[PDB]
Amino acid sequence: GADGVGNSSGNWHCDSQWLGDRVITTSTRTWALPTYNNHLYKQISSQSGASNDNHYFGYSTPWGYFDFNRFHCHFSPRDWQRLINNNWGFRPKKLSFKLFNIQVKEVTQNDGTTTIANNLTSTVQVFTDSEYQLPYVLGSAHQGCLPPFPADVFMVPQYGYLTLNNGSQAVGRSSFYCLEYFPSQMLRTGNNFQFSYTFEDVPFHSSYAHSQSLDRLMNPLIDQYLYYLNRTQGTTSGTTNQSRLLFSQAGPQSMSLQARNWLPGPCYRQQRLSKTANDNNNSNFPWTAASKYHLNGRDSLVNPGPAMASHKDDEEKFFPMHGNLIFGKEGTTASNAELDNVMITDEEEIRTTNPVATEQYGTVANNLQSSNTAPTTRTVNDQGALPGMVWQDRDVYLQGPIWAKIPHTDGHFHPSPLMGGFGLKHPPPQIMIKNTPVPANPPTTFSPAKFASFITQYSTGQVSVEIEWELQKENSKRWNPEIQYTSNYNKSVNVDFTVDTNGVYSEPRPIGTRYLTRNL
Amino acid sequence: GADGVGNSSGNWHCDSQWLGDRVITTSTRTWALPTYNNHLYKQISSQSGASNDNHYFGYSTPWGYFDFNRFHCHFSPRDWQRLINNNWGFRPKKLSFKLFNIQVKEVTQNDGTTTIANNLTSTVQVFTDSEYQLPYVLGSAHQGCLPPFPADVFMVPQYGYLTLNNGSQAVGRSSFYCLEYFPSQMLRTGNNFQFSYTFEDVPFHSSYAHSQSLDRLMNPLIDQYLYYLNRTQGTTSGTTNQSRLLFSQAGPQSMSLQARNWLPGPCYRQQRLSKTANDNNNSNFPWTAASKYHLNGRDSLVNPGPAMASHKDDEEKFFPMHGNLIFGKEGTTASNAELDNVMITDEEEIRTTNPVATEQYGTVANNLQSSNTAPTTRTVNDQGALPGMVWQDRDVYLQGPIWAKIPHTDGHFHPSPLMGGFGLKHPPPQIMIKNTPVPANPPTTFSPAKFASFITQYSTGQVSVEIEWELQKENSKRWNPEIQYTSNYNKSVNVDFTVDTNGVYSEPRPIGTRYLTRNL
Amino acid sequence: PKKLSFKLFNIQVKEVTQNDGTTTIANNLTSTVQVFTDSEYQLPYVLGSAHQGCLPPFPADVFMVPQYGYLTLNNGSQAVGRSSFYCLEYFPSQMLRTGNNFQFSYTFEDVPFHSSYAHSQSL
Ligand SMILES: Nc1ncnc2c1ncn2[C@H]1C[C@H](O)[C@@H](COP(=O)(O)O)O1
Ligand SMILES: Nc1ncnc2c1ncn2[C@H]1C[C@H](O)[C@@H](COP(=O)(O)O)O1
Structure with a gap:
């Protein structure tokens, strides 16, 4: 897309409706991005003898990144309720990423007053790691996701990665990555960024809980035709009764002894x-x-x-x-x-x-x-x-992680994210963002010295993420009512999942996913 | 339909599935029917000076009848939950009535032993008051409906109606009805009865509750431009201040005083x-x-x-x-x-x-x-x-009435059943049933005397009622979770809505319908 | 296993009466029986637990049809709110009189051959 200065490069799409067979979650938030690391890549490492199990070596990049690996980024409290209380399971399907309404403000500290204005001719740079060549730093419970509450504004986090290390030192096999060696799209005010992704095949989550048990699976009324040994010595103990091998046929009475x-x-x-x-x-x-x-x-x-x-x-x-x-x-x-x-x-x-x-x-x-x-x-x-x-497996909560990049190794067992969610070989790629460096005032005489005098500026705009969700409907012949998540109808102080007296959204409790019952 | 002796005239259809847009409830129960009033129509009336506000005059008929004017006749506890917690409203649409697997057993008390056997050549009689010519006795909270629990067997109630009366006496304008003067279908073993009905247009029930109030409907932040009088005398009360007419502009402060x-x-x-x-x-x-x-x-x-x-x-x-x-x-x-x-x-x-x-x-x-x-x-x-x-209007509960026949008068106001439900001009007609009288042994000499010696016999079989329900889905932009009906997840004695130690289904509490919130 | 064919037939319903000290058994022709198959797997699967009541090894032997009983989530002698109560009457079932029969065909999924062999070599 290509338009002008006084023309918005996008609209505020934040809504969700249901299809009974699936659900589409649209989310839009306002973001702000500073200039990280002073337009510099910095080598970071562990303190000289500060900790042992916490030794590390890596780098700090001038780039920021977008993240929404939290369920509350997409579902509202209410939606999450409908979801939880109605569906056997669910999963991700499609994805739509959009960046727009970009504004680059440059700030100047003159005397004791900070003035902020518009640098229209300035650009910002975006690119998506779709070849998965940059270290995947998502799915680690980091902060900087999209605000649960739509009205909230957020700061775009900074990109930093780790590498192979030998204590405080690094090995020759370590890797240094420059995000500038990646083709990126530069945007002026009126430019926008577009991206579409398609989730792979990944097993539904368990939005259910078993009404049966592993050991309590058999028939309470009928006995097994199999035999087990339950007496090694204890016989008609009185005269000449040391030991004898005795077997019993499993019954409803021998419940924790039956064949399994x-x-x-x-x-x-x-x-x-x-x-x-x-x-x-x-x-x-x-x-x-x-x-x-x-x-x-x-x-x-x-x-x-x-x-x-x-x-x-x-x-x-x-x-x-x-x-x-x-x-x-x-x-x-x-x-x-x-x-x-x-x-x-x-x-x-x-x-x-x-x-x-x-x-x-x-x-x-x-x-x-x-x-x-x-x-x-x-x-x-x-x-x-x-x-x-x-x-x-574990469970996903309204504020829990969504997906996780399964490591590219020779072998995996049951590749489900330990923190919970969907293990993906190829997960929603990383979207990078950074303010294009603007040289401050240059000298009339030529200098070979590395340039380090830049105009201070920050970027801001909107971002939109649309995700489609496939649903697994509930098919139970349970006669009596099942348990449902609900709000306390009682006279209450503040309303669950709401802003307070001075405007702060707060999530009262964690929300499970297992409220409906299925058998074994 | 017409078949034989060793051939079932119907199957056990009891199930319900959902269409997201509507729901079909199929119900089948086993019924039993005695011989009421000894094959006789009897004139009943109030006791000679036993009560005053309870005086009455009517008749008792040898006929029985079918009824399912209770929600628990069609919905299971679980279904009712889904319904309640998900839909703005709902209503009846279609109806399918089926009688089958009829068996006529005749009993004889020989000495001190009651023997029961098969009288194959005996019939039963059914007919449906579709012209609405028989007094509508349904929608009066009477008993004899279909058992909430499918496994339970029920006795088919007896038909009795009332008429205009002057105390214990009757007026000349009273009406006597003979159900024998109605064309009825007689069925032998292997015969079945079929009937289809179509509900009229009737407003959805309120499966919702208002999140706003009548008096709390305006804007908390802005003041009204209308004026009201709030002071008749109380002025700058000290010197020469008896009375003065003073008006105030409605504000958020004068909340219970604002124009309505x-x-x-x-x-x-x-x-x-x-x-x-x-x-x-x-x-x-x-x-x-x-x-x-x-x-x-x-x-x-x-x-x-x-x-x-x-x-x-x-x-x-x-x-x-x-x-x-x-x-x-x-x-x-x-x-x-x-x-x-x-x-x-x-x-x-x-x-x-x-x-x-x-x-x-x-x-x-x-x-x-x-x-x-x-x-x-x-x-x-x-x-x-x-x-x-x-x-x-009121509310309908899992065990409450469903419909009610709006009286045929010159005028009605807001014709909604006072006990709750759907007021119908033409409601599901009455289905009558009775065992065809079988003359016992007759004399070799002719007798003009009324016949009163009959063979004692009762009928039994299955009945099936299928009802389609139109649904009104929920469309709310409520952010925080709404209240839902749920079972107590706590360690419990008996299970809610279940049989006990000796086989008796019991409905713990009444179930409302209003759990979801809509505005005004 | 590959395919499956289930058939019920020659049904007779006998009703018994204890009059004095003698049990008499006769035919109640107008009586029915009810069958249905849990193909949606909505009823607790109680098979594959070595229970008794199978078909007799010897063809000439007659057998008694077992009774259905199931278990649920429990907290000791008590039950939890998440437990489940099932009514088999809330399932559509075919009712049969004498002369009626029941039919059912099933197709096994892909499942690895059993080892009807033993290794002549060692690890
Ligand atoms: N989140 C997630 N993603 C992918 N697979 C999952 C997940 N959770 C459980 N599984 C199971 C499903 C497959 O049977 C198996 C494949 O393992 P493999 O090691 O791939 O042969 O792993
Ligand atoms: N249960 C039921 N049945 C029919 N109408 C209902 C019911 N509940 C409320 N109403 C309202 C709807 C119409 O606006 C009005 C017609 O009244 P009328 O006297 O017919 O002009 O009555």
């Missing part, structure tokens, strides 16, 4: 924590007692491990040591905030397919029992994969 | 009752203090009067003297049951359009105020209709 066809999902035990700050051990163990992995001799915390249940029945107070995603309430410092200032997510719908995160896995034998030796039991704390296991 | 364009709905004050059996007056006033009407010098209790709100804000304990429909729990005598044995329905969603049932209506002047006379106020307890009034 399937196993629970894998596991990686997490430490149990209480929300009550006195049930816990009087010691600081969020690192020395937490489950972690290490690569290249570098410890890294296994935060959202395999999908495991948060708590067993009749507790609802013990959450796993970081066994789930925790969201921070609006207005709360990034450094050591209170327990009443965060929102911990409960994964208690997957109890029927998944092992409890804090609890064990089960029992394993590890000896040759006999008259000479007593049978030994081992408590299994870590279980790899097994032929016959079935599990449910 | 609309009025609340009509009213007929009801007496206030408390659920706490000690707040009330120590006197029995359910008749001597209740609002009632009288025709022909006969008192009749105004049970579900005009649609009025049950209680004002911050109470939820005071219900109107019969100002709403009350349902009896499963297993509870018809005579003086406990308060904890009934379900009282709350009409607290229509607070914004309707006057409170127990509270007053407002203030009216009734004198010519002056220096000589002080202004007089009258508390209005009864308000007819008024140009500019707007009201919401």
Whole structure:
């Protein structure tokens, strides 16, 4: 598209309607972009002896980027409700990215007054990493996404990437990337940017919860025709009754003893924590007692491990040591905030397919029992994969991640984003943005010296993201009502999901996705 | 249709699927029919001096009838949920009635043993009052409908009608009806009955509740340009300031004083009752203090009067003297049951359009105020209709009535069934049923005497009712979540809407229809 | 497995009466029976749990048709709000009198051959 100065290069498209078979979410926000790194690429690295498991090496780029890898970027509270309460599952389909109404303001600090004006002849630069040649930095829960509330304005984040490193140093195999060596479209006021993307085939999310259990799958009325051993010694114990091999036919009575066809999902035990700050051990163990992995001799915390249940029945107070995603309430410092200032997510719908995160896995034998030796039991704390296991993945919440770029390696197992969502080989490419550097005043004499005197300026405009969603409708013969998400009809202070007395949108609680029931 | 003995004349069609634009409810139940009134039409009437406001005159017919004027006859608990939580409104469209799998069993009491067998050569008789010539006895909350639970069997009710009466006596203008003077189809085993009906145009029900109020409709920020009088005397009161006419311009501050364009709905004050059996007056006033009407010098209790709100804000304990429909729990005598044995329905969603049932209506002047006379106020307890009034009708619950035959008179006002539902000029006609009388053993000598010796027999079979429902989808731009009906996810004793330990379906609570919000 | 053909026939409905000390059994011709197949897989699948009531190994043997019972999500002896109650009457079913029959055809999906072999080599 190509138009003029006094002619808007786009309209405000923010709406969503339903097709019963699918739903299209249109979102528009206002963005602002500073000049990052002073038009410079900078080599960043770990502090000279400041930390060990946090060593790193990379670069800081003068470029910014757009992101909307949060569900609340596209769905409104209400829409999310309809979605959750009605559909077995859902998925992404298409994508439409649009940049418009661009304005480049240049600022000057004269005396003690900052004046801002229009630099019409100035441009901005956009390009999309569709060949996936730039390090994919999205899908890491970073901030700078689109505001949940449409009326809010946001600052466009800065691009920074990491590389292979040996402590504070780097290896010869490390990689340096210049985004200037990429063809980019430059835009003046009245120019716009267009982009269309098509999601790959990716399994529906589980917007459902099982009404049956793995162990409670059989028939309560009929007995099995299979036999198991339940008595090794205990006979008609009185006279001459040491031991005897006795077998029983499985019945509704021997419910946790019946033959089985399937196993629970894998596991990686997490430490149990209480929300009550006195049930816990009087010691600081969020690192020395937490489950972690290490690569290249570098410890890294296994935060959202395999999908495991948060708590067993009749507790609802013990959450796993970081066994789930925790969201921070609006207005709360990034450094050591209170327990009443965060929102911990409960994964208690997957109890029927998944092992409890804090609890064990089960029992394993590890000896040759006999008259000479007593049978030994081992408590299994870590279980790899097994032929016959079935599990449910995590959950997506209104403010959770949407997709994630599956790493390009030789092998993957069950490539679903650990933080939750859709694992994509080729995910919505990265869209870069940056203000074209404008040389300040040059000398009448020639200078070979690198240019570093530029006019200070920032850009602003609108951005629009349209996404189509395929839906999986609900087909259940459940007689009684199922559970639905709802607002408290009671007389209330402030309205859930709303601005306050001085204009600040706030998301009260996290929103699960599993409210509807399907069988096994 | 015409087939044989060992050939079922129909299948069990009980299911419901959705079309997003409409929903079709198919229901099948098993019915049983005795021989009523001993194959006789009987003249019934009021007891010789047993009651005065309960005097009556009519007849008892040997016929039975089919009824399904209850929503739970067609919708399952779950379906009702989907319906309620998703649609602005709904309505009836088509109808399909089917009778089949008929069996006529004749019983004989020989000694002390009742033997039951097959009388194949016996018939049953059906016909549908489509000319509306038989007194419409449906839409009166009578019992004998189709069981909420599909597995339950029901007894087919008996037909009885009333006529014009003068106390215990009747007038010459009274009417006697013989259902034998109607053409009816007789069916043997293997015969079936078919019937299709088409609902008329009738306004959608309000499956919504207003998010705005009548008095709270204007703009909170801007002031009106209209003026009202708010001060008659109170001036700069000190010296020589008796009285002065002063007017104010309506503002957000004068909120309950601003000019108005609309009025609340009509009213007929009801007496206030408390659920706490000690707040009330120590006197029995359910008749001597209740609002009632009288025709022909006969008192009749105004049970579900005009649609009025049950209680004002911050109470939820005071219900109107019969100002709403009350349902009896499963297993509870018809005579003086406990308060904890009934379900009282709350009409607290229509607070914004309707006057409170127990509270007053407002203030009216009734004198010519002056220096000589002080202004007089009258508390209005009864308000007819008024140009500019707007009201919401009652509500339909999972177990409430569906339709009602609007009486054929010279005039109607707002012909909506007082008990709630769809007022129909021509509602689903009455379907009659009766076992064809079989003469027992006759004498070898001729007798002119009326025959009264018959073989005792009862009929049984299946019945199927299919109804199509037009839906009005939800189109709201509400940002925050709306309230939804849901089951308590908590650890529970018995499951809501389910059979118990010995096989008895029970409906826990009444189900409203207004969960979604629309503006004014 | 590849294909499947299910057929019900020669149905007879006998009704019994205990009069004095003698049980008499006779024919109730006008009586029906009801069949339906969960093809939408909406009823809890209770098969494949080694239960009894299958078809007799020996053809000459007669068998009793088992009863349907299912389980749901539970919290000890209690149930959760997310539990599910199923009524098989809310399913369209075909009713049969004497002389009526039931027909059904099914097609297995692609599933790897079973190992009717044993390796002559070792790992
Ligand atoms: N989010 C997501 N994306 C892709 N695949 C998923 C996902 N979640 C579960 N799976 C399953 C579906 C396939 O059966 C399997 C392919 O693994 P492979 O290692 O590709 O053979 O992985
Ligand atoms: N249930 C029902 N049936 C029919 N009409 C209804 C109903 N509820 C409200 N109304 C309104 C709709 C029309 O504007 C008006 C016709 O009244 P009339 O007296 O017919 O001129 O009555």
